[PDB]
Design a protein around this nucleic acid. Structure first.
Ligand SMILES: [Ca+2]
Ligand SMILES: [Ca+2]
Ligand SMILES: [Ca+2]
Ligand SMILES: [Ca+2]
Ligand SMILES: [Ca+2]
Ligand SMILES: [Ca+2]
Ligand SMILES: [Ca+2]
Ligand SMILES: [Ca+2]
Length: 293
DNA sequence: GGGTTTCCACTTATTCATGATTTTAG
DNA sequence: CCTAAAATCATGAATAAGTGGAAACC
């Protein structure tokens, strides 16, 4: 049964809130609604979704395309369990803003106001601020006054369990083999990396101070920008990053990556990475990790 | 019921994870 | 020389979010 703060950190990484406002000829107001929370993962991490479903006793699990599986929670009574969790263990990325809109929509629907014109109008004003906002259709049907503005979230990491859940979503453990003018000709470097859209720069920057190490890099692709928190200094990896996740367990197959990674850190601690046999073992491990991803 | 809810198959854009080479520090 | 640390450059798909259709009641 997943620790609740690990669960929240994982939801910050992998969850999404949904609000559907659909044309419906059989609905009294011309529209039907659906509200919910979902996580979509690669099929290999299905057991996480089964563990969440069992931990919360809500949601349905289905294939999502050919390589992924989703846990989707939209049964209205199930949504109270979502609210109860995130009231006690609140999200800390910009997704908390989407949670706040989700709660506002939930309140409209709890009052059955979504079955009247004005409740539909209120849900449209809510949806305009949520995720990608109103569709063209909805913007057509509701050209009224609809601001897309909402407040920025600016929160710090609450604890290391949140961090373990978030890293189980967004983190990467890698062995970097660097062509080198070394005696062996290859430098072994361990890297820990977490990637996130630039909208959560404050949270990412706080990783530096929270963990006591690492750097932030920015990267572009056309208009699309993201940040990466990175650690490669071995003493920081060995004395700060590895202990954190030894005491705050990762979930999903990334746990296996972390375990292999630690095997290499052990070799480096003993200076075995400077030996031909140590280097060859490290190569085997890296091949095992990289193979499966 | 029949208006509403909930589920299930499936799609899409892009934010992730991932992979590598080059350079600098010491 | 030698090794560690940091910087730069890259890319495909798991995500992050969403859509079409309809069974299933209450
Ligand atoms: Ca994410
Ligand atoms: Ca159920
Ligand atoms: Ca992930
Ligand atoms: Ca993710
Ligand atoms: Ca691979
Ligand atoms: Ca599109
Ligand atoms: Ca890698
Ligand atoms: Ca996902």
């Amino acid at each position: 049964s997943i620790n609740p703060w690990i669960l929240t950190g994982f939801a910050d990484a992998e969850g999404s809130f949904l609000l559907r406002i659909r044309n419906n000829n059989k609905s009294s107001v011309g529209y039907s609604t659906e509200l919910g929370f979902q996580i979509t993962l690669h099929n290999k991490d299905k057991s996480i979704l089964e563990n969440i479903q069992s931990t919360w006793k809500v949601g349905v699990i289905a294939n999502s395309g050919d390589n992924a599986v989703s846990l989707k929670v939209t049964r209205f009574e199930d949504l109270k369990v979502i609210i109860d969790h995130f009231e006690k263990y609140p999200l800390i990325t910009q997704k908390l803003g989407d949670y706040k809109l989700f709660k506002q929509a939930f309140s409209v629907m709890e009052n059955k106001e979504h079955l009247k014109e004005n409740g539909i109008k209120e849900l449209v004003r809510i949806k305009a601020k949520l995720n990608w906002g109103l569709t063209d259709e909805l913007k057509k049907a509701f050209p009224e006054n609809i601001s897309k503005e909402r407040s920025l979230i600016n929160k710090n990491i609450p604890n290391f369990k949140w961090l373990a859940g978030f890293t189980s979503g967004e983190g990467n453990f890698a062995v970097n083999l660097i062509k080198s003018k070394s005696k062996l000709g290859v430098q072994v470097q361990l890297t820990f990396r977490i990637t996130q859209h630039i909208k959560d720069k404050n949270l990412m920057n706080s990783l530096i101070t929270y963990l006591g190490c690492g750097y932030i890099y920015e990267q572009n692709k056309s208009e699309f920008s993201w940040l990466e928190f990175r650690v490669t200094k071995f003493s920081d990896i060995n004395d700060k990053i590895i202990p954190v996740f030894q005491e705050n367990t990762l979930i999903g197959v990334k746990l296996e990556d972390f375990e292999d990674w630690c095997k290499v850190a052990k070799l480096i601690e003993e200076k075995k990475h400077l030996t031909e046999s140590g280097l060859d073992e490290i190569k085997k491990i890296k091949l095992n990790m990289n193979k499966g991803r």
